[PDB]
Amino acid sequence: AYTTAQLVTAYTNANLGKAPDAATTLTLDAYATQTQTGGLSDAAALTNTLKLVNSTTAVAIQTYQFFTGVAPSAAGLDFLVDSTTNTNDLNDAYYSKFAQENRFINFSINLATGAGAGATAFAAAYTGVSYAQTVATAYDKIIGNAVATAAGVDVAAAVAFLSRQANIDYLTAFVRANTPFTAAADIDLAVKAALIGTILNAATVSGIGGYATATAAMINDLSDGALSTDNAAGVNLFTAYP
Amino acid sequence: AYTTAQLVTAYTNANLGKAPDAATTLTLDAYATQTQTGGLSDAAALTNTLKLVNSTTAVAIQTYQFFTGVAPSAAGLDFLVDSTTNTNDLNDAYYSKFAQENRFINFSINLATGAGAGATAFAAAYTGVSYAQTVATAYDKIIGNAVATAAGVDVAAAVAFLSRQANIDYLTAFVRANTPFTAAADIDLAVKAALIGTILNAATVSGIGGYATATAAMINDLSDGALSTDNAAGVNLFTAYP
Ligand SMILES: [Ca+2]
Ligand SMILES: [Ca+2]
Ligand SMILES: [Ca+2]
Ligand SMILES: [Ca+2]
Ligand SMILES: [Ho]
Ligand SMILES: [Ho]
């Protein structure tokens, strides 16, 4: 049985020192009183609390891992999510009009195609490969292929959907309008980055797959105030949380 | 098998020393003779007896808990329900023309928006949140969300109903006419209080949910004359009756 004052501290540390909105406080409060009456177990309540930190935090853990091969350190996460120094950060003013999806896409393009940390590596790996393959391989990397089928979701129907011509056209226009790219190669390259972003979203929302399960465990460890692993130059998810 | 003289004592202590009306005596009598013939079990008869004390007592236990975080002590309950000192009390002359519903609404507005004990806390918690969210979160706090679905009642249909525009308009007029509030903020705040009141009624009438089940157990303990928990400065329902 959690006091409503414990669930807010668990939420605050997950959000890296951002105190919850008035609205969400009421949501947390419901989860507390549903544990005092035994209409909800303890572990269940805590998971739902940490589910609310998806947009702010999970966006920074997941994308960094996929592109640079390592999740940011606790100190680094602070900078990306909730800081004094970064004027514009994930739980700040700039981003308050981006949905969950457009947050993932934003982070992806940044890290991948710009002067970002992942640019040189992602540029060499995904050159001269088709949209179809980009999606298929990435789907398997993130969500697994075996795991998805066991979970009951049909892989073939999902991959086809993401790579249909209508989808590609939508992104092409999106990337052309928003990003300062004009070259034919860089636009192509950025579209791929946006697709992988879309997949990361689709992963974290369903809870299936390796990426989603590890990120959940990192946020759980981060909940209590102190991150156990906390290597100075980044934590590799798959090493630390088996 | 209960003698009709035992069911009246069980009713009297639940009502805190108010002896039942002529009409209800006849109802209790039926419940007695239905236990002597074995057309009704013992526990069943006693529950129905205590179901009749809903309007008078359950109104004071439930509302106090929701707004001040603690049900009133036995001594306090006496004051609210059936006393010499309080000229106007729940089972007295003032309230004899209020239905069950309007009793809940009355108590809510008192405790929440006035100079009542809950004013300062409720004022800070429910400021700058919409009608929709007020209802949704409160529904879950009181009735549970998981519990309701298992019980078979569809949550979405019920919450939508409570927050439909027609409902809000009815209350707005109601609050404006009855309460001495003229400010635009206080009226807004009082409407929310009235909604939560409506939900408390809807809870106690169906028997579903954490709030309703605990209040039933407190009344059962109060039935025999002596309240076991009886902390001087209030009994927290969810601690005392697991
Ligand atoms: Ca900032
Ligand atoms: Ca930890
Ligand atoms: Ca009196
Ligand atoms: Ca007792
Ligand atoms: Ho922070
Ligand atoms: Ho009394």
Author numbering:
A (entry chain A), B (entry chain A): 2 to 243
Reproduce passages from the article.
Surface layers (S-layers) are proteinaceous crystalline coats that constitute the outermost component of most prokaryotic cell envelopes. In cells of the bacterial species Caulobacter crescentus (also known as Caulobacter vibrioides), the S-layer is composed of a single 1,026-amino acid residue SLP called RsaA (Smit et al., 1992). RsaA has a canonical bipartite arrangement, with a lattice-forming C-terminal domain (RsaACTD), consisting of residues 251–1,026, and a cell-anchoring N-terminal domain (RsaANTD), consisting of residues 1–250. The assembly of the RsaA S-layer is divalent metal-ion dependent (Nomellini et al., 1997; Bharat et al., 2017; Herrmann et al., 2020), as, without divalent metal ions, S-layer formation is inhibited both in vitro and on cells (Bharat et al., 2017).
Furthermore, cryoelectron microscopy (cryo-EM) and cryoelectron tomography (cryo-ET) investigations have demonstrated that binding of RsaA to lipopolysaccharide (LPS) molecules on the C. crescentus cell surface is also regulated by Ca2+ ions (von Kügelgen et al., 2020). Based on previous structural biology data, full-length RsaA has been predicted to contain 22 putative Ca2+-binding sites; 19 in RsaACTD (Bharat et al., 2017) (numbered 1–19) and three in RsaANTD (numbered 20–22) (von Kügelgen et al., 2020). To verify the Ca2+-binding sites in RsaANTD, we reconstituted the RsaANTD:PS (RsaA bound to the O-antigen oligosaccharide of LPS) complex (von Kügelgen et al., 2020) in vitro, in the presence of Ho3+ ions. We performed cryo-EM single-particle analysis of the reconstituted complex, producing a 4.3-Å resolution map. Comparing this Ho3+-bound cryo-EM structure with a Ca2+-bound structure solved previously (von Kügelgen et al., 2020) showed strong densities in the region of one of the proposed Ca2+-binding sites. The proximity between this Ca2+ ion and the previously resolved LPS-binding pocket suggests that it might play a role in stabilizing the RsaANTD:PS complex, in line with previous results (von Kügelgen et al., 2020). Site 21 in RsaANTD could be replaced with Ho3+ and observed with single-particle cryo-EM, suggesting strongly that it is a Ca2+-binding site. Since all three proposed Ca2+ ion sites (sites 20–22) in RsaANTD were stable in MD simulations, we expect that these are probably also true Ca2+-binding sites, with sites 20 and 22 having less propensity to be replaced by Ho3+ under the conditions used, or Ho3+ is not capable of substituting for Ca2+ in these sites.
